[PDB]
Subunit: 237 residues, 4 copies
């Protein structure tokens, strides 16, 4: 089915499918079993920031996650994305809850993509930045339980009125326009993504996490991907 | 039908519908009869550059058209776009030919839009830049005879293989994603558009012109808008 | 002496030199007696945001000042800056206190300037953004009592350790590199400046204000410009 | 003396100081003896483009050099710049000629630097872009024989009126403002530089090359650095 490349912010350790024994950040290339992970000192109720970068010369996907006044976590993986994804993709955010839960709120999201050709001055670029989400955000495709406009935020998974997070929820938000990540005459292709999130849970064991992902343009939530599968994969293979 | 705001680069003087007696640039608010025009010293076969700017504080749409080594032409019009267009629009390029013709080639196109909120640091932005167009440009909606990929260019109206422009042709290209130009808490909204074009005709009387336009998101080419109506209006009212 | 163009955030009404009877925003072209002003509902202790824009086609300097959850204030003035300032200038922030006082803290400052030539694709640009100021900010020229690094902020006027603002203080911060605002082949020149500030005073009558200004590159604080003269002018003419 | 990190475009093979037997691109960390090099198919009289990128997470300096209609050359080197350069640096372009010569013309130059803090939304950035150089470019420090304004270009080494390049020439151009490349709370620091150049020589054996470099802020041309030492190093160690 879908082709997924994702950076996961995994809040619950599912050691049975390969997660380390703590909250962690990981790089997923077509499988929920991360190719690489780093321990993440997740802070319930605090606003964090994730930064994701990549370029076609180095062929290394790197991510940094931090909280104000704290040391940051970083994970990197060598991978040639031209060999994994199609030339046209869509980028988005995904999150899920299962038996354990949490709010998966997005307060801001920016993305920049650049394709530099061998022609003198030939640069194709795409940049979007949301610091405020409105009730009817026509430039986003919302899937599953994702909603916008609440407090000017993006709520990826269900939250009840009292502001409480609901279990077994899954939601994704994708930028409306397709993104071009390869071109036959490109000499350098690169992208950078930043998002700020608020993960809060009334429980000691929050679950499941948030992921930034890149997929085929027609990607949709796979059946039964609530919980540990982050709304990205159909199974744990 | 559609709601159109356009900056026209009108190459043929249709004095019967209000055009001045020379090639000119004009600002069209819902009608082909420009609200304002300026004489334009059009240069057959030369690459020109058009710059369009606007902001919600000044409420003035201004455009500058120039050619290398030449004096530029400029036209400005006071208009509050919040009172003319919907909150969500699509931006694009349109061109036509009729009994007289010309090539309407686009070599590059960039657009930036910004919505600054009253919240501290709340900026929503959209930026795209094409310096090269590919055969299958999934982030553009091509309408009518518009095609991409020829010489890495965007051909808005039909050109035969030998490179000759065809008469009675009409084509438009729109950026795929909707653009947000008003938000209830916005303190300043602004946009800027730049495009470079090559208008060439084997004839002494080239026709009809190229226009940068902003419209309702579902805008489509009105019937019989070839020729003097630039692929934007259904009639000359 | 110096040539000054400034947007003032005037917190104290010096009706004897032309200020309206309330806190106001104004546009100063070579004199502290603003060419234009608008009433400003100044909020003691709240973080505000000022946005300043200008372009050589419209020849209109406009500014918008707002606070979160509040209506904004705006002032505009028609002026051709090519006829007032030199081709090379420096941009900066200035503030003062006199018998009455206040803190003049800058939490962030961004500036973008663009010169678009008539050559195809000829754009010269300069952009800087500070969201954090460090103790030794080598890209700023600090004049008078201005200091950086305190809380990652820029303090334009003196504040004692307990955090209290001092009277008769004056300070300015200028971006190190000269800015080019005119070029003989330019078709459009424009700039945009944004800054967020925190004006706080233990008193009912805070004074004197903060100004964004543009000046000759070698501008320095005029003698006796504390108080009502905002660190910008030598006298009240 | 100076601390230099440079990307060289070396046009003459000085095999006696370690150059490969052909024109090449190389990464120089404090010595003219490149840490890494790649063969470069240099094209006399054609306009080329160099792209340089780096980020503090990956710690890899990479460069790509290309000509229109040709395959590009690329070289990469793992290096932690925080361990080699000071926290504040200046960036620039340098070139030289010796017994053999060539024109070292720069037609455009852009640079972007970003420091992302662990504070939510804390980004410091600097960006400059020159597509046209004027006779009196006050935002550049010109050293040695470098001159601006000729044809709107930057001439790094001496060219006589007839347009002929002179031997034993050396020149550098540095951006006026210091650049901040490290900050104690930074989570990611990165930069990207692009320049287009025209190397032309009436001779079969052009010499010496052009380099993009990063140095201590007070760097100056070392004595006797004409020729093979590219205006960057005092000797061949
Ligand atoms: Mn898990
Ligand atoms: Mn995991
Ligand atoms: Mn006409
Ligand atoms: Mn007309
Ligand atoms: Mn006053
Ligand atoms: Mn005043
Ligand atoms: Mn050499
Ligand atoms: Mn070498």
């Amino acid at each position: 089915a879908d082709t997924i490349v994702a950076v996961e912010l995994d809040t619950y350790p599912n050691t049975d499918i390969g997660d380390p024994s703590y909250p962690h950040i990981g790089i997923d290339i077509k499988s929920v079993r991360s190719k690489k992970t780093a321990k993440w000192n997740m802070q319930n109720g605090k606003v964090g920031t994730a930064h994701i970068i990549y370029n076609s010369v180095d062929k290394r996907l790197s991510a940094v996650v931090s909280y104000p006044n704290a040391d940051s976590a970083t994970v990197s993986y060598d991978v040639d994305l031209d060999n994994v994804l199609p030339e046209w993709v869509r980028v988005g955010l995904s999150a899920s809850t299962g038996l354990y839960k949490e709010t998966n709120t997005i307060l801001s999201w920016s993305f920049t993509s650049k394709l530099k050709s061998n022609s003198t001055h030939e640069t194709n670029a795409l940049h979007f930045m949301f610091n405020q989400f409105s009730k009817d955000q026509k430039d986003l495709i919302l899937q599953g339980d994702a909603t916008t406009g609440t407090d000017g935020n993006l709520e990826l998974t269900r939250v009840s009125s009292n502001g409480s997070p609901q279990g077994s929820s899954v939601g994704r938000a994708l930028f409306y326009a397709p993104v071009h990540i390869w071109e036959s005459s490109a000499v350098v292709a690169s992208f950078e993504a930043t998002f700020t999130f608020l993960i809060k849970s009334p429980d000691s064991h929050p679950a499941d996490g948030i992921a930034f992902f890149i997929s085929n343009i027609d990607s949709s939530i796979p059946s039964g991907s609530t919980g540990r599968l982050l709304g990205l994969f159909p199974d744990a293979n």
